[PDB]
Amino acid sequence: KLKLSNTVLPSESMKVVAESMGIAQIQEETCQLLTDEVSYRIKEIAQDALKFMHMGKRQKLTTSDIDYALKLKNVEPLYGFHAQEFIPFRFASGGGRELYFYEEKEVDLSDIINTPLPRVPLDVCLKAHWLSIEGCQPAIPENPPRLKPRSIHELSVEQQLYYKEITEACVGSCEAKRAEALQSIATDPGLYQMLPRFSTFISEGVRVNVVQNNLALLIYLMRMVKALMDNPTLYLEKYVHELIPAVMTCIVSRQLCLRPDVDNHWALRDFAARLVAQICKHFSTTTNNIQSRITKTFTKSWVDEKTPWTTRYGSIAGLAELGHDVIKTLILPRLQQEGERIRSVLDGPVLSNIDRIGADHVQSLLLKHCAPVLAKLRPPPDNQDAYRAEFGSLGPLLCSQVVKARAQAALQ
């Protein structure tokens, strides 16, 4: 079965071209005579431009194939203009005209100058790899993918040794070892069918690594989670039920080790955990299961009275990095409680606890979020004392942050 037809250009487009040129009152047989001649020349060239596609070993007809197919038929590749003399440009392709159907048809002549030029890509290089080792295809990233008998483990001993080396490198004794192991996790195609043992090693590790608050052990495991996530080959949402309570624990937990000093890293432990938490709510999303569940736990962490301030700071960060609308709808009715907590830490003399440090970090983070939440939905008028209607927390400094954001927008 083949119902192949002969499609030509419409004749009602050929009369528009003729009467817009000075040739009026053309007959239909005169007009049909134009649209079978030019529809043959399009068919003659597209059959001839398919020769250059096959010879160049491509499956996509590029724009340059018609430039060589035209030159082959002794017609100039120039499309925009036609030179009768033909001497200024002799069968020289000018690359066509970058024109659109939905274009503006008028631009400003300094808009084209002030835009940044695109980056010239890398030059052609020759890398070698292995498709087959004595018949077997390796799983390198340059490749695509009555007694019962004594069973064998589903991992090979090269795979089991690889797992042991990657896990002993990912506990961060040496930094270059970590970084390669993290890139190896980030792009090994055959890292599926080893992923249960990696997820179990992560999950089990954080839970026996918060018994004593060992920050590096945790910062390395969170980097291992981040390296597991951006791998495109492996299927992760079968294992995310172990991954998510591990990261929530990094963000919402108390620190058993020295309270100050590494709190700077602790904020990053909560920064890396809140980054991977909102990346996990970005992926793996179905109706009302993952994002709303962690949002509900973060909000009942917030509205809980008389919290640990480490847990408070971590949950504040976690609810803060959830996107545009989430701080637009959630952080709004709670400024008074935040201010009262700050006032209590300030009044009570107790300085040797971690409450004061937790309070300062929470207030700074909340004030930065409130700044764009404001820069985003209102004009920058009355930036001096109108914020005193919102208890006067960030005030003019918040206004200065909004002004810096406006300057960044102007630079963009």
Binding site: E237, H241, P245, T249, S284, N289, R293, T297
Partner: peptide, 25 residues
């Protein structure tokens, strides 16, 4: 549609919130 593979993934069938360790000791 309740036999869709996702329904049976244990993220959508497990109270994994209970695992998060808060103030452990």
């Amino acid at each position: 549609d309740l036999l869709a593979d996702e329904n049976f993934l244990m993220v959508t069938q497990l109270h994994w919130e209970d695992d998060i360790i808060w103030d452990g000791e």
